[PDB]
Amino acid sequence: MGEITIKLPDSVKVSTNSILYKCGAKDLSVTYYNAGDISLAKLELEDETVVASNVISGSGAKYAGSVYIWWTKGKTASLYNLIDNPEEDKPISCVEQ
Amino acid sequence: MGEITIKLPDSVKVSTNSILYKCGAKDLSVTYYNAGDISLAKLELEDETVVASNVISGSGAKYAGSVYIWWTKGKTASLYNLIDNPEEDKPISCVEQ
């Protein structure tokens, strides 16, 4: 296969945005998938490839996928692994590129 | 468009399972998208159509999407809306069909 096709119950428009973030000394390729309310972000992490959904948040866009939290405020974003850091308070900082 | 294509960085196999759950007196069509670690569930809710990702859990499969929590233990599953119920403790019970 190689690809996940989610068929949406409508003719909604679907957009794909890719961003390069630099997290410390590592690269991270994140691709966003937007279709109205639906918003996914595929995190191509070294540890495991994750597809996270946009979850409830107050400021920024919080994304939840496997054990990961991808929280983006603008060009900045915080990477949380909930097993490395169950408190969700010692994130890895990333910069958009 | 009408469809979300997530292109996976590999030739992993991708499977699609659809289930009918009955939640009280309503129907719910849920489709699961599995590709290794990656696991999504499109919830075709009356309120809004949601695509949730599999998140960290201890028992069952917990899925997070928008303000929704879809938690499945077997044929049973609990639907939480975090704005209706911020405590995540008064779920709507659903039965597989």
Beta strand residue intervals within chain A, DSSP E: 3-7, 15-23, 26-35, 38-44, 49-55, 61-65, 68-73, 76-81, 92-96
Residue B49, domain member (yes or no): yes
Tell me, yes or no, whether B8 lies in a domain. Answer: no
- Cα–Cα separations (whole angstroms), residue A33 to A9, A63, B63: 16, 12, 18
Question: With 0-12 CB in 10 A as exposed, 13-18 as middle and 19+ as buried, what is A52?
Answer: buried
- Give the domain range for residue A67: 13-97
Scan for tokens 């068929």, then name that residue: A7
- Name which of B65, B55, B42, B52 is nearest A65 in CA terms: B55
Contact A12, A35 (CB under 8 A): yes
* Contact flag A50-B38 (C-beta cutoff 8 Å): yes
**Structural domains of chain B, count:** 1
Nearest chain A residue to B42 by CA: give it.
A6
B38 touches A53 (CB < 8 A):
no
Q: How far is CA B23 from the centre of its chain?
A: 13
Q: Give a yes or no: residue A67 inside a domain.
A: yes
Residues with Cβ within 8 Å of A55's Cβ and at least 6 positions away in sequence, in order, are A62, A63, A64, B64, B65, B66, B67
Using CB atoms, pick whichever of A8, A66, A67 lies closest to residue B4.
A8
Q: Is residue B45 part of a domain?
A: yes
Method: X-ray
The verdict on residue B4 lying in a domain is: no
CA torsion B80→A52→A90→B67, rounded to 10°? -20
Q: What sign results for the dihedral spanned by CA atoms A97, A81, B64, A72?
A: negative
Distance from CA of B12 to the nearest CA of A (A): 5
Residue B75's contacts (CB-CB under 8 Å, 6 or more residues apart) are B95, B96
Query: Is there a domain that residue B3 lies in?
Result: no
Residues B40, A53: C-beta atoms closer than 8 Å: yes
Contact B3, A8 (CB under 8 A): yes
Kindly provide the resolution of this structure in angstroms, with one decimal: 2.4
- B29's enclosing H/E stretch is strand B26-35
> Would you say residue A17 lies in a domain?
yes
Here the CATH number for the domain that contains residue A93 is 2.40.128.200
- Compute φ and ψ for A40, nearest 5 degrees: -110, 155
Does residue A4 lie within any of the structural domains? no
